[PDB]
C-alpha cells in the first residue's frame, strides 16, 4: 500500500481533531498544500541528523502534490506524522498536550533505534601484528593498515 | 615572458593576438621518429607490490 | 476463540466509555475506521521496538476490516487494547487518568516479560580451551571456534 | 527547486498565524518589507557566529526586492524561518511559546551539525621525529613542520 503525502497531512490534522472525515469544517486546500510543503521541508532538513530514511524528494522544478507518493515504508507514519503535528499546530495557535508529546516522543525513539549504527574504532595503523599471525607466508604486512 | 618578473625569460618576445604559427610536417605522413635528450630529461621507475594474504 | 481487530478496536473505546453500552450515545463507522488504520500503524511499528507478536498483515491494497481475525493469542489484547487507547484517545479531545496509565504500564511490562532475549554472550575466538579437554590433530579446536579469512587470488585487495 | 525571498517571511507569518489563510486575514505590505529588512539584517550578522552559508547579499545600493532569489538551500529554510520568526514577535508585542522555542532550537541543531569542523591539533615543529622514519631523504623531515 502506497504512503501518499496528502494522508499524511490528512492524518496529522485529524490526529489533534482539526479537520476530519466526521468533522462539519470543510478545511480548505491551502492548508492542505501549506501542511505538504511543511512536510517537504522538515523531510529534506532531516538528511542531516536522522541520516537518510527513504525519502523521494519531487526531483526538477515540479512542485510537491499531495497524492504523490513518499515512498517511506509504513512503520515511519507515525513517527512521520506526530512531528510534523508538533511542528505544525503553531500554525492554528493551539497548545500540545503532555500525552501527545509522550506518544511523539516513542514515536521518534521507535524510529531512531531503528535506524541506530556504531562504529567499530579500528587500529591505529602503527600497530604491530604480533609473531602468531605467521606474517610473510599467511599476510603480507607486519602492521596493521588501518584505513580505507 | 613575464614583465614583473625578468629572470624567469625564455622567449625572445610575448606572443599576441595574429601571431603566425606552422605545423612541422604532412598532412597524414605516418613515420618512425628518431629522439635525442639530456640525462635528466625524463625519468622511469618500477614501484615494487605487496605479496597478497 | 479467534479475535478479531473489530473486537479489539471496540474493547478500546468501551474502556475510556465513548462508546460502550453505558452511554448516551453509540459506536459510529468512522470511530471503528479510524481505530481499525490505528491500530494496522501501531502493528506496523510494534514490528520493530518489540518482538514480533504474530500480527495477520492484510496483504495487496485491501482495506483492513474489522470483521477480519488478527491471530493475537488472547494474553495479548488488553495490552494491545491500552495502546490503542493511548495513541488514539487524543483524536476526541480527552485526557487520560492515572489509574487508565498504571493499568496500560502493567499490561505493557506483563506484554514484555513473554518476550525476553538474555543473549548470553559466547567465548573471544582466540580463548585457548583446556588441555583436560583431550583435543586432537585432525579436529583441530586447539581454540573456540571463530569467524575464518577468505583469500581470492584475483583481487589484489591487499 | 529554487527558493526566494518573500518566501522565508510569508513562512514566518504563517507559523504565528500573524497573516496566513487558517484564518481569514491576509498579509500587509509593511509586514513583508520589515521582515525583508530584518531578514537581510540577520543574514549579515550570521557571518560571524554560525558562519557562511551561502546567502546571497544584495549589490548596489537598491533594496533587497522581496521576489529576488536567496541562494540558500531548501534544508536551511525551517532554521531561517524560525530565528526570523523570534525577532519580529517584539515588533507586533506577541510572546513566543514553549513549543516553537523548543522546535526553533531543534532546527538550529541542524544547522550547526552540519556546517561543523572539529580542528585537529598538530604537532609543536621542535617534537623530533623518530628513527624509524628514515629522515635522510625528504625536505625538512628531521623534524615535524609545524604550521603551514
Known amino acids: 500500500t502506497v504512503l501518499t503525502k496528502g494522508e499524511i497531512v490528512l492524518f496529522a490534522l485529524r490526529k489533534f481533531a482539526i479537520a476530519s472525515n466526521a468533522s462539519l469544517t470543510d478545511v480548505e486546500p491551502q492548508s492542505i498544500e501549506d501542511g505538504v510543503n511543511d512536510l517537504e521541508d522538515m523531510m529534506s532538513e532531516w538528511m542531516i541528523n536522522p541520516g537518510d530514511i527513504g525519502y523521494a524528494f519531487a526531483t526538477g522544478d515540479e512542485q510537491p502534490l499531495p497524492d504523490d507518493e513518499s515512498g517511506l515504508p509504513r512503520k515511519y507514519k507515525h513517527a512521520v506524522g506526530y512531528q510534523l503535528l508538533l511542528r505544525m499546530l503553531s500554525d492554528y495557535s493551539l497548545e500540545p498536550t503532555p500525552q501527545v508529546l509522550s506518544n511523539a516522543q516513542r514515536s521518534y525513539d521507535a524510529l531512531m533505534t531503528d535506524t541506530l549504527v556504531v562504529p567499530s574504532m579500528r587500529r591505529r595503523g602503527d600497530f604491530p601484528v604480533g609473531q602468531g599471525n605467521k606474517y610473510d607466508v599467511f599476510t603480507s604486512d607486519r602492521y596493521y593498515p588501518g584505513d580505507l | ?53
Do not use: W
Open chain 2, 1 to 53: 615572458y613575464d614583465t614583473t618578473n625578468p629572470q624567469y625569460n625564455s622567449v625572445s618576445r610575448q606572443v599576441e593576438a595574429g601571431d603566425a604559427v606552422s605545423v612541422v610536417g604532412t598532412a597524414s605522413q605516418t613515420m618512425k621518429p628518431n629522439l635525442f635528450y639530456n640525462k635528466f630529461f625524463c625519468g622511469l621507475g618500477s614501484i615494487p607490490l605487496p605479496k597478497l594474504h
